[PDB]
């Protein structure tokens, strides 16, 4: 009853710090059956282990980088900066998104597909190379559409966030994309994105 | 009527502008009231 007790005190130190938020350049896709996500220009598949399809079906979807243009040809890719350019890629369709999720600057290259043939050449993982392909870039309805023939149709649409940059004339840019270095399991990949414009 | 119709048009235009003003206010209030309270 006659307790009347004193009291001690044990403090707990507390502190933390938000680091420099790290940009993860990750692409996601569910083209045929697998929710594959890859980090990356060295390529490494995060989830969606050894792909049921070949890598090439998705190698064409890979801001911050743009093709090399001469001084004669207006470089819509370049002057669209600092914001960059958002494109719609039709193969299966591909779109690039910039989001702020969590503490990672997400440069999504979100992939999606359908109409996978039961014996199509894209899933047996056979692959020789991608021969140099010329994209004819021209303006249809205020959107920079690039028509390219796939050799191993592409209906690329490029829109700048700065909707004031003048549209370049219809030219023919030669892309040469090939899977430089990889592994058999295709989990440690190095990609090539060389491409130069030609009038 | 005529001056009163002019007042009617004045007030409807100021409403038309103030609607988008409210929209902008809501936009920026969501911009600052984000989430991680």
């Amino acid at each position: 009853g006659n307790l009347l007790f004193l009291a001690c005190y044990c403090i707990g130190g507390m502190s933390a710090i938000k680091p420099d938020m790290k940009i993860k350049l990750r692409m996601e896709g569910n083209v045929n059956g697998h929710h594959f996500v890859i980090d990356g220009m060295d390529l490494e598949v995060k989830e969606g282990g050894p792909l049921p399809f070949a890598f090439d079906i998705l190698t064409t979807a890979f801001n911050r980088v743009f093709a090399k243009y001469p001084d004669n040809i207006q470089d819509y890719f370049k002057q669209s900066f600092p914001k960059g350019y958002s494109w719609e890629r039709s193969l299966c369709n591909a779109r690039n998104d910039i989001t702020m999720e969590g503490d990672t600057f997400y440069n999504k290259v979100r992939f999606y597909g359908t109409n996978f043939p039961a014996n199509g050449p894209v899933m047996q993982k056979k692959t020789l190379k991608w021969e140099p392909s010329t994209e004819k870039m021209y303006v249809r309805d205020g959107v920079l559409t690039g028509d390219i023939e796939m050799a191993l149709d592409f209906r690329t649409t490029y829109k700048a966030k700065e909707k004031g940059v003048k549209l370049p004339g219809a030219h023919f840019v030669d892309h040469c994309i090939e899977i430089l270095s990889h592994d058999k399991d295709y989990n440690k990949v190095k990609l090539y994105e060389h491409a130069v414009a030609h009038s | 009527i005529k001056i009163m119709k002019s007042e009617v048009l004045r007030v409807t235009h100021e409403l038309q502008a103030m609607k988008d003003k409210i929209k902008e206010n809501s936009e920026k209030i969501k911009v600052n009231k984000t989430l991680p309270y």
């Binding site: 420099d20 940009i23 801001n63 743009f66 900066f81 600092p82 914001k83 960059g84 910039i98 700065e162 | -």
Partner: protein, 280 residues
């Protein structure tokens, strides 16, 4: 392959620096940002003639904080006014964090450099910029292939690029590994300096206004009493000087009080009598 010289400088105008400081403080504790306009005069010069702020966004300071509509319209209407300068670079404020570039800062700077190889990313600490020193730096980048190959980021041809030493705080946050500091020089012509001089240019009047004579007498009384105590201390200390071989000074304080007394009273006398004889 061409290499950026270490003698390259960023000539910030007076107006640009003032606008940058004002905007950086006005957003404390948030990090504000904006675009610096100017011109790349040559390979060794980047002139920042002006800088306009950008609306605050919940994103923070990122490549998504540059609203294309705002930037485009501001540039167009400034060009209408007479300022048709390209977007040289971008600036943002690190309040109390020192001057450096974080991962996202490096990211936005990569975005800007994609627009033009020469492009600076000056940052300003608005709360460390206490009167006197101004804490501000300007960094571009280092290409990863340049660094991994072992070649130095920037060719050197003079001592200009090394007159100032890098800070530890910047160095740990990636300085000389991913971005290099660019020397900053302030372009202040005579006209701007003379205009700024009016901030504390007293008047033509206070040169002729006498001190409140009662206040003057009270100040004289107080300082003379303090000087009396100091003289007592000085006498006491000097008496010790004799019985002490070479082995606060009541003298230095005494000299300071003497100087303040003579300046105050000489000024007051002269001002008073000039007043007596210029005003009838």
């Amino acid at each position: 392959a061409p290499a950026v010289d270490t003698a390259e400088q960023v000539y910030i105008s007076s107006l640009a620096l003032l606008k940058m400081l004002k905007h950086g403080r006005a957003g404390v504790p948030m990090e504000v940002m904006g675009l610096m306009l100017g011109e790349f005069v040559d390979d060794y010069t980047v002139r920042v003639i002006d800088v306009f702020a950008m609306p605050q966004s919940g994103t923070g300071v990122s490549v998504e904080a540059v609203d294309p509509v705002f930037q485009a319209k501001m540039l167009d209407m400034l060009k209408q006014t007479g300022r048709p300068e390209m977007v040289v670079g971008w600036y943002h404020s690190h309040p109390g964090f020192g001057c450096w570039l974080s991962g996202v800062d490096i990211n936005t700077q990569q975005s800007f450099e994609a627009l033009s190889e020469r492009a600076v990313a000056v940052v300003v600490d608005p709360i460390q910029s206490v009167k006197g020193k101004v804490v501000i730096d300007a960094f571009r980048l280092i290409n990863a292939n340049m660094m991994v190959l072992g070649h130095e980021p920037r060719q050197t041809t003079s001592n200009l690029g090394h007159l100032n030493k890098p800070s530890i705080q910047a160095l740990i946050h990636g300085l000389n590994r991913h971005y290099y500091s660019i020397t900053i020089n302030y372009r202040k012509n005579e006209l701007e300096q003379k205009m700024l001089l009016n901030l504390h240019k007293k008047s033509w009047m206070e040169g002729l206004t006498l001190q409140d004579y009662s206040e003057h007498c009270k100040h004289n009384e107080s300082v003379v009493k303090e000087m009396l105590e100091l003289a007592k201390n000085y006498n006491k200390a000097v008496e010790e000087e004799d019985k002490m071989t070479p082995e606060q000074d009541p003298k230095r304080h005494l000299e300071e009080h003497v100087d303040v007394l003579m300046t105050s009273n000489i000024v007051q006398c002269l001002a008073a009598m000039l007043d007596t004889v210029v005003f009838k």
